[PDB]
């Protein structure tokens, strides 16, 4: 819409977006992951018995 002459952001290269705008060569190669929670180790040993 003319509000910006460029997009400098983590904007992934897509098929739909490529039809309307021209992406540069990627400056960062990556993919999609899943983020989940973590636990600190405890050894879960109740006692010496």
């Amino acid at each position: 819409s003319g509000q910006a002459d460029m997009i400098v952001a983590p904007l992934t290269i897509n098929n739909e977006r490529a039809q309307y705008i021209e992406f540069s060569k990627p400056f960062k190669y990556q993919g999609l992951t899943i983020l989940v929670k973590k636990e600190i180790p405890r050894s879960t040993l109740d006692s010496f018995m």
């Binding site: 002459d5 904007l11 309307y20 021209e22 992406f23 400056f27 190669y29 990556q30 999609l32």
Partner: protein, 49 residues
């Protein structure tokens, strides 16, 4: 595992005169090791164990 491996690009309009020079200025920064510096100072921290 990584899925949908699509990189980050600098979006511009299809009529832009900078598209040729922007991509070349990104490929050059990849070979010169500049984009590995931006990885070091911003992405590669690793903080805790």
């Amino acid at each position: 595992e990584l899925f949908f491996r699509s990189g980050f690009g600098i979006g511009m309009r299809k009529d832009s005169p900078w598209k040729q020079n922007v991509s070349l200025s990104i490929l050059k920064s990849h070979e010169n090791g500049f984009m590995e510096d931006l990885d070091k100072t911003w992405v590669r921290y690793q903080e805790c164990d």
